[PDB]
């Protein structure tokens, strides 16, 4: 039943939230809205409360509000950000106009760790183990992240990690010397083909490299510069991959480059644990069909210390038949409402 809400101006707008949430402090905007840290007095947790920015302004907005909610409602894994609460001050569909999402707030992201302390090989094991464990889960529900990078990894005081912003940039946001593109699989970066979940394993290799060396693995100054950084390391594509690049235009550009062999990763990653080098070669394969999967990677010797086949769970089935559905604003909105109304908090 309905808790009492209180109002306050934050981030230049009125936030109206249940009493349980106290000490709301703006912490900068996230995916499609402003975020505040809060103390949840009912659970004792430090939480992130996101107020969605104009969630039903357009069809595109309405459907992405519905999508984010559906996604967050489905995720129930230690290494994936789940939904602690969702609420609206509206008392009926007629007055439904705002959506607030509540999740765990961790001390920092991986960006802050990568810059602010030295990572032992053990820290790299633990962190990558945790990303692959959440990724096996995500992938098992047939969801793709597409945008895995250190700023989408929430890490706490004890190096416990949660993945954020799965299954959700403008051409301008992908332009130039920008982290928003440094972790992207080449096939998605230059639209070579119909892409799948394997793109995610590529980003994991980029992240792992960077934890090991302290440096961005492919800090391209633009798409072409980055492509060259990638090809230098992994080699130009062979005949078999060229056929799978179904963009004739892109296939043709690729073919204009002088062929290069795959470099020796032991000389690229000097000092690195040999098991880590091996895993990097298995993740950083240009042919996406041949990259190691998350499930397979968890069973790689590098994670012997953490691997436990009985505690690496799969997801319940995720119905995203809505993705290919054409609905009006008021219909995505009604659907969203039903999802808010029927939310049951975690146990
Ligand atoms: C992903 C999400 C869904 C609903 C509400 C908020 C958010 C969100 O952007 C977010 C949730 N947790 C974190 C988080 O823990 N980030 C790590 C962090 C804290 C301070 C700096 O980085 C972000």
Secondary structure string (H, E, C) spanning the chain: CCCCEEEEEECCEEEEEECCEEEEEECCCECCEEEEEEEECCCCEEEEEEEECCCCCCHHHHHHHHHHHHHHHHCCECCECCCCEEECCCCCHHHCCCCEEEEECCCEEHHHHHHHCCCCHHHHHHHHHHHHHHHHHHHHCCCCCCCCCHHHEEECCCCCEEECCCCCCCHHHHCCCCHHHHCCCHHHHCCCCCCCCHHHHHHHHHHHHHHHHCCCCCCCCCHHHHHHHHHHHHCCCCHHHHHHCCCHHHHHHHCCCCCCCCCCHHHHCCCCCHHHHHHHHHHCCCCHHHCCCHHHHHCCHHHCCCCCHHHCCCCCCCCCHHHHCCCCHHHHHHHHHHHHHCCCCCC
Ligand 1 pocket, residue 48 CB under 6 Å: yes
CA–CA gap between residue 144 and residue 197 (Å, rounded): 5
Cα-to-centroid distance, 320 and ligand 1 (Å): 24
Contacts 24+ apart (CB under 8 A), 172-181: 174/223, 175/222, 176/221, 176/222, 177/219, 177/220, 177/221, 177/222, 179/149, 179/150, 179/151, 179/216, 180/149, 181/220, 181/223, 181/226
The ligand 1 atom nearest the CA atom of 165: 1
Q: Are 236 and 255 in contact (CB under 8 A)?
A: no
CA–CA gap between residue 105 and residue 45 (Å, rounded): 8
- Which CATH code for domain 108-314? 1.10.510.10
Q: Give resolution in angstroms.
A: 1.9
φ, ψ of residue 270 in degrees (nearest 5): -65, 125
Q: Which of 105, 156, 157 to mutate to test the pocket of ligand 1 (most atoms within 8 A of CB)?
A: 105
Ligand 1 pocket, residue 161 CB under 6 Å: no
Q: Are 247 and 221 in contact (CB under 8 A)?
A: no
Cα-to-centroid distance, 96 and ligand 1 (Å): 24
Among 140, 76, 138, residue whose Cα is nearest residue 343: 76
Cα-to-centroid distance, 165 and ligand 1 (Å): 9
Alpha-carbon distances of 312 from 46, 270, 297, rounded to whole Å: 26, 31, 12
CA–CA gap between residue 345 and residue 3 (Å, rounded): 14
Q: Cβ-count burial of 21 within 10 angstroms (0-12 exposed, 13-18 middle, 19+ buried)?
A: buried
CA–CA gap between residue 184 and residue 288 (Å, rounded): 12
Distance of CA 41 to the CA centre of its chain: 29
Ligand 1 pocket, residue 284 CB under 6 Å: no
Ligand 1 pocket, residue 25 CB under 6 Å: no
Cα-to-centroid distance, 111 and ligand 1 (Å): 13
Cα-to-centroid distance, 28 and ligand 1 (Å): 10
- CATH 3.30.200.20 residue ranges of the chain are 1-107+315-344
Residue with tokens 């998350």: 294
Residues acting as catalytic residues? 165
CA–CA gap between residue 234 and residue 265 (Å, rounded): 9
Ligand 1 pocket, residue 144 CB under 6 Å: no
The ligand 1 atom nearest the CA atom of 35: 6
- Which CATH code for domain 1-107+315-344? 3.30.200.20
Strand partners, 258: none
Among 31, 168, 164, residue whose Cα is nearest residue 105: 164
Ligand 1 pocket, residue 154 CB under 6 Å: yes
CA–CA gap between residue 302 and residue 281 (Å, rounded): 13
Q: Which of 11, 24, 33, 35 to mutate to test the pocket of ligand 1 (most atoms within 8 A of CB)?
A: 35
Residue of minimum CA distance from atom 5 in ligand 1? 50
Annotated binding site for ATP: 27-35, 50
Residue 63 token pair: 């459907």
Alpha-carbon distances of 256 from 259, 260, 279, 317, rounded to whole Å: 9, 12, 30, 44
Ligand 1 pocket, residue 212 CB under 6 Å: no
- CATH 1.10.510.10 residue ranges of the chain are 108-314
């Amino acid at each position: 039943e309905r808790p009492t809400f209180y109002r306050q101006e934050l981030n230049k707008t009125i936030w109206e939230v249940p009493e349980r949430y106290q000490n709301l402090s703006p912490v900068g905007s996230g995916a499609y809205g402003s975020v505040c840290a809060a103390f949840d007095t009912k659970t004792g947790l430090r939480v992130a409360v996101k107020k969605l920015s104009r969630p039903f302004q357009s069809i595109i907005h309405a459907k992405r509000t519905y999508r984010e909610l559906r996604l967050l409602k489905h995720m129930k894994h230690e290494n994936v950000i789940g939904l602690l609460d969702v609420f609206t001050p509206a008392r009926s569909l007629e007055e439904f106009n705002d959506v607030y999402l509540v999740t765990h707030l961790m001390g920092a992201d991986l960006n802050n760790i990568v810059k602010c302390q030295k990572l032992t090989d053990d820290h790299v094991q633990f962190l990558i183990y945790q990303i692959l464990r959440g990724l096996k889960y995500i992938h098992s529900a047939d969801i793709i992240h597409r945008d895995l990078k250190p700023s989408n990894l929430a890490v706490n005081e004890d190096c416990e990690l949660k993945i954020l912003d799965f299954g959700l940039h403008t051409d301008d946001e992908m332009t130039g010397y920008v982290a928003t593109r440094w972790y992207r699989a080449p096939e998605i970066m230059l639209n070579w083909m119909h892409y799948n979940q394997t793109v995610d394993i590529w980003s994991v290799g980029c992240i792992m490299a960077e934890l090991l060396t302290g440096r961005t693995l492919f800090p391209g100054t633009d798409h072409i510069d980055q492509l060259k950084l990638i090809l230098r390391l992994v080699g130009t594509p062979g005949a078999e991959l060229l056929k799978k690049i179904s963009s004739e235009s892109a296939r043709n550009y690729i073919q204009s480059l002088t062929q290069m062999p795959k470099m020796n990763f032991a000389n690229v990653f000097i000092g690195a644990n040999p098991l880590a080098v091996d895993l990097l070669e298995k993740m950083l394969v240009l042919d996406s069909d041949k990259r190691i999967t998350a499930a397979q990677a968890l069973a790689h010797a590098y994670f012997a210390q953490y691997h436990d086949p009985d505690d690496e769970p799969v997801a319940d089935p995720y119905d995203q038949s809505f993705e290919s559905r054409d609905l009006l604003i008021d219909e995505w909105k009604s659907l969203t409402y039903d999802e808010v109304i029927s939310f049951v908090p975690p146990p």
